[PDB]
Scaffold this active site. Structure first.
Site, PDB file in Angstrom:
ATOM      1  N   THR A  39      -8.309   3.090   8.990  1.00  0.00           N
ATOM      2  CA  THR A  39      -8.674   3.915  10.135  1.00  0.00           C
ATOM      3  C   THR A  39      -9.795   3.323  11.003  1.00  0.00           C
ATOM      4  O   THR A  39      -9.737   3.397  12.228  1.00  0.00           O
ATOM      5  CB  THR A  39      -9.066   5.352   9.671  1.00  0.00           C
ATOM      6  OG1 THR A  39      -7.952   5.992   9.017  1.00  0.00           O
ATOM      7  CG2 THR A  39      -9.498   6.193  10.860  1.00  0.00           C
ATOM      8  N   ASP A  59       0.838  -1.184   0.000  1.00  0.00           N
ATOM      9  CA  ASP A  59       0.000   0.000   0.000  1.00  0.00           C
ATOM     10  C   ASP A  59       0.881   1.244   0.000  1.00  0.00           C
ATOM     11  O   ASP A  59       1.805   1.366   0.806  1.00  0.00           O
ATOM     12  CB  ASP A  59      -0.898  -0.039   1.224  1.00  0.00           C
ATOM     13  CG  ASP A  59      -1.875   1.081   1.258  1.00  0.00           C
ATOM     14  OD1 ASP A  59      -2.130   1.666   0.196  1.00  0.00           O
ATOM     15  OD2 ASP A  59      -2.383   1.392   2.350  1.00  0.00           O
ATOM     16  N   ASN A 108     -10.123   0.679   0.232  1.00  0.00           N
ATOM     17  CA  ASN A 108      -9.091   0.689   1.260  1.00  0.00           C
ATOM     18  C   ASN A 108      -9.674   1.099   2.588  1.00  0.00           C
ATOM     19  O   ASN A 108     -10.428   2.077   2.670  1.00  0.00           O
ATOM     20  CB  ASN A 108      -7.951   1.621   0.886  1.00  0.00           C
ATOM     21  CG  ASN A 108      -7.160   1.118  -0.299  1.00  0.00           C
ATOM     22  OD1 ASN A 108      -7.619   0.251  -1.046  1.00  0.00           O
ATOM     23  ND2 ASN A 108      -5.956   1.660  -0.479  1.00  0.00           N
ATOM     24  N   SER A 145     -12.635   4.646   4.862  1.00  0.00           N
ATOM     25  CA  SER A 145     -13.224   4.333   6.165  1.00  0.00           C
ATOM     26  C   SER A 145     -14.557   5.066   6.345  1.00  0.00           C
ATOM     27  O   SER A 145     -14.749   6.157   5.819  1.00  0.00           O
ATOM     28  CB  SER A 145     -12.258   4.668   7.308  1.00  0.00           C
ATOM     29  OG  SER A 145     -11.311   3.627   7.496  1.00  0.00           O
TER      30      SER A 145
HETATM   31 NA    NA Z   1      -3.509   0.738  -2.173  1.00  0.00          NA
HETATM   32 ZN   LIG Z   2      -4.382   5.218   0.764  1.00  0.00          ZN
END
Ligand code: NA
Ligand SMILES: [Zn+2]
Ligand SMILES: [Ca+2]
Ligand SMILES: [Ca+2]
Ligand code: NA
Ligand SMILES: [Zn+2]
EC number: 4.1.2.13
Lengths: 296, 295
Positions: free
Chosen positions: B244, B82, B241, B201
């Site tokens: 958090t 990432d 993604n 998130s």
């Molecule tokens: Na990514």
């Molecule tokens: Zn990111």
């Protein structure tokens, strides 16, 4: 460089020093421990209880350790089952790749202890794995008896022994003056002539306690084995010193702190980097105390 | 078992659903995510930032994932770098065993981005590994669709992270959340590849409630509403993604146990509840995005 339990302890036995046996329940603990070992040029005894194994999965516990071994291929490491409760437990540990196992039947009468210990020793030894057992039980003043240890050791053919001499697990070991029967220790060392193990050997250093108490913790009445007693124990012939409570207190101390001093903090790394440091320092100091440092 | 990022993602692309991509920094997070994957029968995208990899070591990051894969051999799992920042970072990931890598050069100009991304793509694809890139910068309240078409065509990248108004952190929107789904659909249309939503998130009310009840402080925190998450997937987002929400959910329980019992120093007592809360955040998100029962 993962190796038999008593490759490490036979060496410790003849030169007469102690090797810390340090428990872990996850990556953070394991990493801190190996870094200490690396920083103090010290052999490592890594141990996981049945509870620890259940928590992480035996595949993961042995998996993580073998990855740390590749990272520090120069440190002798034994991976040890702490307080195995049954034959099948020891046996699973053996199949998963542990190189040492403890079979704790010290609550049984002598003959049952011996009988189960000996059953464990045989499948263990057959697979290239060393074994610990216990005699007497862990409370203070019960206490092991030398003569039966002599006998117990000979009949079972066990690699190392944990004679109770007055320690107990946890942060509250002594209600009175620290008392440990060193004479008993000596007699047992003398009669058995193998590596001895000291359970309930956390010290509860003043900085570790202070660190915990500063962070909001509660440790009223807590009292580990004094460094002096730890030192005398090794003179007596103790070669494996089980240490767990000290690590956990030092670790959680920093977690408690970080939580306290920053309410918007939720980056895990911010919590476990100081915790790892504090643990690692407890381990490095203990390796020096016991004589492990620079033994690689 | 470990598989190529776009094996999972291409399936998601055509069948029209989102797969959560969850960040992890240690064993506790890794375990929670896998159990959630197991309990919802969802394909897993596991990710580690450059920072998490440095924290645990790339040997250990790949190590535990390979152990967790043997444990749950029926779950398709991609392991993804990432925000890889350099060719060199992507390349170590590839050699260590990742099955996916993000080369984030979105802060550069179009041509510098395409140039580096293609370089990563060439060596990734040569090792059978898929690649993500980013276009636009992430920041509250953006990608250009027709260059995205060129970017993708020129680079041969496997998926792309178009910016549409999300940003990392517990504080994504000054005021009301807003995202440009028109950009999105146009991008999806022009590119015809899996798209990736970063800063996704949701900061659910229960997770926030838990963290504030534990004495936490999320003054002014807002994340992408479930509604928008859903719309994003209609738009064509296939990879969401999510970091958090995990950390907040996890750390809340840690904070609680510390507050609840001052003499408590058994690690497992802190992390068992925290794993549970993380796992539940992951399972709900899997259902929300539609990864559920796709195994
Ligand atoms: Na990514
Ligand atoms: Zn990111
Ligand atoms: Ca016992
Ligand atoms: Ca960026
Ligand atoms: Na032991
Ligand atoms: Zn013990």
């Amino acid at each position: 460089m993962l190796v038999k339990g008593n490759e490490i302890l036979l060496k410790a036995h003849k030169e007469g020093y102690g090797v810390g046996a340090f428990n872990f329940v996850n990556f953070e603990m394991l990493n801190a421990i190996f870094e200490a070992g690396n920083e103090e040029n010290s052999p490592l005894f890594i141990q996981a209880s049945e509870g620890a194994i259940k928590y992480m999965g035996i595949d993961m516990a042995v998996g993580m350790v073998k990855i740390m071994c590749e990272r520090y291929p120069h440190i002798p490491v034994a991976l040890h089952l702490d307080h195995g409760t049954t034959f099948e437990s020891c046996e699973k540990a053996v199949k998963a790749g542990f190189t040492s196992v403890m079979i704790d039947a010290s609550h049984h009468a002598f003959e049952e202890n011996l009988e189960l210990t000996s059953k464990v020793v045989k499948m263990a030894h057959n697979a290239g794995v060393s074994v610990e057992a216990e005699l007497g039980r862990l409370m203070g003043i019960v206490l092991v008896n030398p003569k039966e240890a002599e006998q117990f050791v000979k009949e079972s053919q066990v690699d190392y022994l944990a004679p109770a001499i007055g320690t107990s697990h946890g942060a509250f070991k002594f209600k009175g003056e620290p008392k440990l029967d060193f004479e008993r220790l000596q007699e047992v060392k003398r009669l058995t002539n193998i590596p001895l193990v000291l359970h309930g050997a956390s010290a509860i250093p003043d900085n570790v306690r202070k660190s915990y108490l500063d962070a909001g913790g509660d440790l009223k009445g807590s009292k580990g084995v004094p460094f002096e007693f730890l030192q005398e124990s090794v003179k007596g012939g103790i070669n494996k010193v089980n240490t767990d409570t000290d690590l956990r207190i030092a670790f959680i101390a920093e977690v408690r702190k970080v939580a306290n001093e920053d309410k918007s903090q939720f980056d895990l790394r911010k919590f476990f980097s100081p915790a790892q440091l504090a643990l690692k320092n407890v381990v490095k100091e203990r390796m020096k105390l016991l004589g492990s440092a620079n033994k690689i």
